[PDB]
Design a protein around this ligand. Sequence first.
Ligand SMILES: [Mg+2]
Ligand SMILES: [Mg+2]
Ligand SMILES: [Mg+2]
Ligand SMILES: [Mg+2]
Ligand SMILES: [Mg+2]
Ligand SMILES: [Mg+2]
Ligand SMILES: [Mg+2]
Ligand SMILES: [Mg+2]
Ligand SMILES: [Mg+2]
Ligand SMILES: [Mg+2]
Ligand SMILES: [Mg+2]
Ligand SMILES: [Mg+2]
Ligand SMILES: [Mg+2]
Ligand SMILES: [Mg+2]
Ligand SMILES: [Mg+2]
Ligand SMILES: [Mg+2]
Ligand SMILES: [Mg+2]
Ligand SMILES: [Mg+2]
Ligand SMILES: [Mg+2]
Ligand SMILES: [Mg+2]
Ligand SMILES: [Mg+2]
Ligand SMILES: [Mg+2]
Ligand SMILES: [Mg+2]
Ligand SMILES: [Mg+2]
Ligand SMILES: [Mg+2]
Ligand SMILES: [Mg+2]
Ligand SMILES: [Mg+2]
Ligand SMILES: [Mg+2]
Ligand SMILES: [Mg+2]
Ligand SMILES: [Mg+2]
Ligand SMILES: [Mg+2]
Ligand SMILES: [Mg+2]
Ligand SMILES: [Mg+2]
Ligand SMILES: [Mg+2]
Ligand SMILES: [Mg+2]
Ligand SMILES: [Mg+2]
Ligand SMILES: [Mg+2]
Ligand SMILES: [Mg+2]
Ligand SMILES: [Mg+2]
Ligand SMILES: [Mg+2]
Ligand SMILES: [Mg+2]
Ligand SMILES: [Mg+2]
Ligand SMILES: [Mg+2]
Ligand SMILES: [Mg+2]
Ligand SMILES: [Mg+2]
Ligand SMILES: [Mg+2]
Ligand SMILES: [Mg+2]
Ligand SMILES: [Mg+2]
Ligand SMILES: [Mg+2]
Ligand SMILES: [Mg+2]
Ligand SMILES: [Mg+2]
Ligand SMILES: [Mg+2]
Ligand SMILES: [Mg+2]
Ligand SMILES: [Mg+2]
Ligand SMILES: [Mg+2]
Ligand SMILES: [Mg+2]
Ligand SMILES: [Mg+2]
Length: 232
Amino acid sequence: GQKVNSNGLRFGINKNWISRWTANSHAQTAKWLIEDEKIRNLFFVNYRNAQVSNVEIERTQATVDVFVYAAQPAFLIGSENKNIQKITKQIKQIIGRTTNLDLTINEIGSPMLSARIIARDLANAIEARVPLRTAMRQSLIKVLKAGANGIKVLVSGRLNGAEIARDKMYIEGNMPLSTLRADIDYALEKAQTTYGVIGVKVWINRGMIYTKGLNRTPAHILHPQKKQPNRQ
RNA sequence: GGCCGUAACUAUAACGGUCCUAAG
RNA sequence: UGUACCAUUUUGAAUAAGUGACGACUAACUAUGUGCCAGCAGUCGCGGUAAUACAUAGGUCGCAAGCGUUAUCCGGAUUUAUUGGGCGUAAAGCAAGCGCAGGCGGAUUGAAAAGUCUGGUGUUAAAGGCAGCUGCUUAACAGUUGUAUGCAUUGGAAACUAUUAAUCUAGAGUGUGGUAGGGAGUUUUGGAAUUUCAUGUGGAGCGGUGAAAUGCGUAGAUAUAUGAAGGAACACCAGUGGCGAAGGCGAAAACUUAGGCCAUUACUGACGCUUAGGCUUGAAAGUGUGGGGAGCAAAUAGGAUUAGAUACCCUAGUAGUCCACACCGUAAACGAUAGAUACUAGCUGUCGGGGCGAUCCCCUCGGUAGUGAAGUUAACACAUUAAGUAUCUCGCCUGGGUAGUACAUUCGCAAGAAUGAAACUCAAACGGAAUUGACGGGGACCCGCACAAGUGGUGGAGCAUGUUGCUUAAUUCGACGGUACACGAAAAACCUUACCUAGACUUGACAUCCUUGGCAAAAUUAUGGAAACAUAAUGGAGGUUAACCGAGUGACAGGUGGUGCAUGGUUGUCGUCAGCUCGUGUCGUGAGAUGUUGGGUUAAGUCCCGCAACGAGCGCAACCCUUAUCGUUAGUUACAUUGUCUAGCGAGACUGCUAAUGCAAAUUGGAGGAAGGAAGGGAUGACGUCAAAUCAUCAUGCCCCUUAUGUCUAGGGCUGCAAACGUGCUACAAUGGCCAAUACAAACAGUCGCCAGCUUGUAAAAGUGAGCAAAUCUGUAAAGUUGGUCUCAGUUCGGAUUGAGGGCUGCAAUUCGUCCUCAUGAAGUCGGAAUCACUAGUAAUCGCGAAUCAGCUAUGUCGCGGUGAAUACGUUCUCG
RNA sequence: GGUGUACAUAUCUCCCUGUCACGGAGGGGU
RNA sequence: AGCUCGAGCAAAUGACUCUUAAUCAUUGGG
RNA sequence: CUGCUGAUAAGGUCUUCAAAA
Ligand SMILES: [Mg+2]
Ligand SMILES: [Mg+2]
Ligand SMILES: [Mg+2]
Ligand SMILES: [Mg+2]
Ligand SMILES: [Mg+2]
Ligand SMILES: [Mg+2]
Ligand SMILES: [Mg+2]
Ligand SMILES: [Mg+2]
Ligand SMILES: [Mg+2]
Ligand SMILES: [Mg+2]
Ligand SMILES: [Mg+2]
Ligand SMILES: [Mg+2]
Ligand SMILES: [Mg+2]
Ligand SMILES: [Mg+2]
Ligand SMILES: [Mg+2]
Ligand SMILES: [Mg+2]
Ligand SMILES: [Mg+2]
Ligand SMILES: [Mg+2]
Ligand SMILES: [Mg+2]
Ligand SMILES: [Mg+2]
Ligand SMILES: [Mg+2]
Ligand SMILES: [Mg+2]
Ligand SMILES: [Mg+2]
Ligand SMILES: [Mg+2]
Ligand SMILES: [Mg+2]
Ligand SMILES: [Mg+2]
Ligand SMILES: [Mg+2]
Ligand SMILES: [Mg+2]
Ligand SMILES: [Mg+2]
Ligand SMILES: [Mg+2]
Ligand SMILES: [Mg+2]
Ligand SMILES: [Mg+2]
Ligand SMILES: [Mg+2]
Ligand SMILES: [Mg+2]
Ligand SMILES: [Mg+2]
Ligand SMILES: [Mg+2]
Ligand SMILES: [Mg+2]
Ligand SMILES: [Mg+2]
Ligand SMILES: [Mg+2]
Ligand SMILES: [Mg+2]
Ligand SMILES: [Mg+2]
Ligand SMILES: [Mg+2]
Ligand SMILES: [Mg+2]
Ligand SMILES: [Mg+2]
Ligand SMILES: [Mg+2]
Ligand SMILES: [Mg+2]
Ligand SMILES: [Mg+2]
Ligand SMILES: [Mg+2]
Ligand SMILES: [Mg+2]
Ligand SMILES: [Mg+2]
Ligand SMILES: [Mg+2]
Ligand SMILES: [Mg+2]
Ligand SMILES: [Mg+2]
Ligand SMILES: [Mg+2]
Ligand SMILES: [Mg+2]
Ligand SMILES: [Mg+2]
Ligand SMILES: [Mg+2]
């Protein structure tokens, strides 16, 4: 049957919030809730070739701070910091010139075990007419070789352009979805194929969190150094 | 021994309802 | 015949390519159109609005001066099986026996040489086939040489078959000796029991069924005792049995009579096996003539059940069942397996003869059974009594339906029996065996407010809301058993709004890309106006164009338009039920099986033992939140009757200790404990089913519209109304109506708000006006307690409906808001068949708060507290 | 009476069932 | 009226469904 | 412990493929 969202079930217990701010009134709460959505959607739908794993937003009465974790931040940086100013102006237009922007790019360590970029690669391969069995097999084998626990990939839709929708699942390793202690990262993406839309959902297991607390700690960004700038 | 209705072209009624008789 | 052919003879790519196919067999794919229509097809099969199968185009493939379609013949087809098949369950062993002709047939000797083998000779016309070569430019073709098969005659071979002449006993019979039998026919005899009749006792029913009714009975039934008559069948013995060729044979006896088993120093000396045709027997039903008739019972009559009952049940009841004599000649006549002969492990019973001599048991020869390896089989299974290794003979089979039908023939008194097709039609068949599920008015076990025990309702009345139907210009669309119907919609007067009428607009109300300037858009005031929009005004923030304000400009924007059966995402349901699978291994030709089943224990595929399985994943459980006790931290805005209360951390409960029994998991009881054996509640919902729901949250393939299906505005509509259903509220009342005083909550919410107090008003509310950005101020707690009154009535119940006067929100309250006051006072007195929820702070009942919201008959939804029950014996029934 | 003679059949509404039939409750028509 | 006596069939249009049948309405047709 | 217990319009998806990593 239907299952609750893996991220939503674990939020507020073993996962911190992607946007951390306290608005003044109900009128401002909607504007701030929509502007952050616009910024995140921008960073995800465009500038996709940089493998942006996640973007967090942190706002005060008047100051906006953006933390963009990316696997290949060279594409965000551009040639001698060219596209950086373009995305800065895009964000400033999105929120407002009256505020102070503190954009900060962060190179994410051990990218392979991140469901967002795994799903994005899956969707890109699907859209590029790559055969599905080979695509999922190579993604699963590279994810496992990255040194993580089980990964479950569900790819549904008009499969290979067929007129009857199917679904194909590959679980390889233990994926306890009912357990709350487990560190399960879940992402979902849409491959826009010439025959319609394909939905790819990737669950990845990254061990068990044996330290009680609302995170306040990096999650698989720490194995190598996670120090990139563009801030003040 | 009667009467009435009834089958996907028409037609008919395998079938159904009912009155009476000792039995039709 | 100026022909084949030849030549440096002039001209010149000039004079020349189609057909089938492209989903698989079978080499070769895309678009357009159609939309179970038009059409294709050798077979499977395509076409229901996304067709590589249809029609067209493009592309590609197979051949080519040919290519396809049609007809016929052969092969593939071992599919008439001599080479070269079968008959237990798929088509096929006659019902069984006695058997002439035919086929086959023990051992040895001799002769001949009919089959068999071999040499010589004659012939088997030429052409054709195969091999070699020559000639046409090579080939096709022509020519040339070689090249078999059968018959006859003659000459040899003698192993095998046939013929003839004989010998032998081992096959088969005969005799003597042992011997078991429900083998058969004819004639007598016997006892239980039913029925009828006769005679006694007796007094209201008997009979029959799921329940009854026809029926029998005070004319004395059923019952009981004695006797008589007649008919049919022969309890117990009676079997993990006997006899016969099969059908079949079971009370006792006599007579006549058939076959079989064992041992044979005896005799005949191959006399044997099978058997077309022929003859004999052949369950039961049926026929003809004559007898007989107790019981039972086709046909028939009535009573029931039933929608109907010509059936199942019951009461009667003729033929028949019985005997003699003549026919019929069919059966699931079955071991679904023809007979004969030789060989091939074993183990356990039982029956008969023989060897020993208490039984019992041992050996030998046979009959009848079970288990079982080799071997066979598609598998089930057979397996010394073969379906195994082989031979001989007979019968039979050749896809399903037509059809065991029709015609002809033979038999019969008759019903009918034997024999037995085709025309036509299908691609398979009420084909065989086995596997996984589903299902069973099939079993075993186990669960759930499922049944049971209770409480309170629903269906009856009025009202609110939703839906079906109908009406209308529109009554926008969706949801339709459980899993739709107070659902999307957590707010339809305008807006919402997607609908109708009407007034207006066109790169557009909104956006990007481009050539281009910014020295605007708003808002408001005038006039025209239903408002959209037009003509004039202040010409505007700013920052030189950043955003936006424009001109030009074609790509286009736009669509709540269709398709949820093209999809992503999200969700309902089985179901918080305990299941769903995988890797390796093993078993099986294969689908598949094992693990996952078996025994215990749980809510659990939870765990422990067992086990050709060993492990693993998702699901289960725990980790998460909250309630129940306590410690510590902190004491304001809580408390301030001093330790409540609020919120961080922590302790505590772990089958931890004990007794019982179990191998162990574990189950039950006790102690202490606030809490005991998932302590209560929540979040958490596996693979998948229903092509389940949503294109109208959003996104999106494809189709459709593009001065209109896109856009703005005003009015109407979503609120209609003979009706029907669902979900709720209010009641029909003294456990109550009205009035007065009055005590005790939790949670939540609040600066276009919560609104304390005061004044005004019968009241909704109005004015003034503090307090509160909140543990501080505000949002009246009601049921409950006491007192007064009503006194069982359509009422001081019940409030619907209706008229009038007012309050608030809002441009605007008529369609269509709600509140207050006054007045009127429908139905309804406990609700038919039938149904719903609930296992403790639960049902019932009483209030309070919040979300969407200017306002709202939300009586709806989500939450909070006050009072606070009854019952669970049990799984026989009911749903899952 | 709509059909055979107030009755039955038939008609309508509600139960029943996945649905229909059967079955059960109620109403009307000379 | 196309057929049987404005009615009922026949035909068409829609609703309905994956598409039909059936059903539901509407409807021209003397 | 044997009441009664009848029926369900037609055609249909759904495996694309292992060449291989
Ligand atoms: Mg063709
Ligand atoms: Mg074609
Ligand atoms: Mg042949
Ligand atoms: Mg043939
Ligand atoms: Mg054969
Ligand atoms: Mg047979
Ligand atoms: Mg036989
Ligand atoms: Mg036979
Ligand atoms: Mg014989
Ligand atoms: Mg003979
Ligand atoms: Mg010749
Ligand atoms: Mg020649
Ligand atoms: Mg007697
Ligand atoms: Mg007889
Ligand atoms: Mg009768
Ligand atoms: Mg019956
Ligand atoms: Mg009788
Ligand atoms: Mg007779
Ligand atoms: Mg026969
Ligand atoms: Mg027999
Ligand atoms: Mg056996
Ligand atoms: Mg035939
Ligand atoms: Mg025959
Ligand atoms: Mg047949
Ligand atoms: Mg069932
Ligand atoms: Mg049952
Ligand atoms: Mg009950
Ligand atoms: Mg109530
Ligand atoms: Mg009611
Ligand atoms: Mg729609
Ligand atoms: Mg509607
Ligand atoms: Mg629908
Ligand atoms: Mg409106
Ligand atoms: Mg200016
Ligand atoms: Mg300028
Ligand atoms: Mg669906
Ligand atoms: Mg199982
Ligand atoms: Mg086993
Ligand atoms: Mg086991
Ligand atoms: Mg759980
Ligand atoms: Mg559907
Ligand atoms: Mg539904
Ligand atoms: Mg659309
Ligand atoms: Mg309007
Ligand atoms: Mg409505
Ligand atoms: Mg009182
Ligand atoms: Mg105070
Ligand atoms: Mg007050
Ligand atoms: Mg009182
Ligand atoms: Mg009354
Ligand atoms: Mg009153
Ligand atoms: Mg009004
Ligand atoms: Mg009363
Ligand atoms: Mg319970
Ligand atoms: Mg449709
Ligand atoms: Mg009954
Ligand atoms: Mg029928």
